[PDB]
């Protein structure tokens, strides 16, 4: 539906579907966020680790109870990604639910 990462990498997206957009034109992406919701036919939006998939409050300020795409982790490009994989799982469990 939609995603963003750098243009230079974005192209790949742009082939089959993923009518993506740049991601170095904002380091806030709010701009895009809203634009995205203008049509809202995109139930999927995901971003690199360039931003961080932790300050979702943008979405909360805009959707405001109208659940629309959860920003998902991508990562700029693999070069290693599996180290922080088993980590991303553990990083979640402690601060969600209970701490171990």
């Amino acid at each position: 539906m939609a995603v963003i990462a750098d243009p230079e990498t974005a192209q790949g997206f742009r082939l089959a579907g993923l009518e993506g957009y740049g991601a170095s034109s904002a380091e806030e992406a709010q701009s895009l966020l809203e634009t995205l919701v203008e049509r809202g036919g995109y139930a999927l939006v995901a971003v690199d680790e360039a931003l961080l998939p932790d300050p979702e409050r943008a979405v909360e300020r805009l959707m405001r109870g109208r659940d629309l795409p959860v920003l998902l982790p991508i990562a700029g490009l693999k070069e290693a990604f599996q180290g922080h994989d088993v980590e991303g799982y553990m990083r979640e469990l402690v601060r969600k639910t209970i701490g171990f």
Partner: protein, 112 residues
């Protein structure tokens, strides 16, 4: 996927552009959201999977090679990106619940 992503620039540095022009919108690229109901407490919440066709060949005949190979990666991408899109959102929602329940547990357990 990324193998080909940068590799397919072989001289395709701007025929990415061309190929997307020449070939795109030829396998479904927008719409297919199924909003789902499942256990949601308090004031209701929807989840969903959005799945519809999305990756293969669609160009007429052979045309460049890297194209076809690259579009083949989408098969492996698109599809896969759906699983984490639909499991990771379920996970956090049920998380809240898990917590929220233990919240009442607390109040009830040592307030009432």
């Amino acid at each position: 996927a990324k193998e080909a992503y940068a590799a397919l620039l072989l001289a395709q540095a701007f025929d990415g552009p061309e190929v997307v022009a020449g070939a795109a919108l030829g396998v479904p690229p927008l719409e297919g959201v199924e909003a789902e109901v499942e256990n949601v407490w308090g004031s209701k919440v929807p989840r969903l999977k959005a799945t519809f066709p999305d990756g293969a060949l669609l160009s007429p005949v052979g045309t460049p090679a890297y194209t076809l190979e690259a579009s083949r990666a989408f098969r492996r991408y698109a599809e896969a990106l759906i699983r984490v899109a639909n499991t990771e959102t379920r996970l956090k929602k049920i998380g809240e619940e898990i917590k929220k329940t233990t919240r009442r547990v607390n109040a009830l357990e040592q307030v009432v």
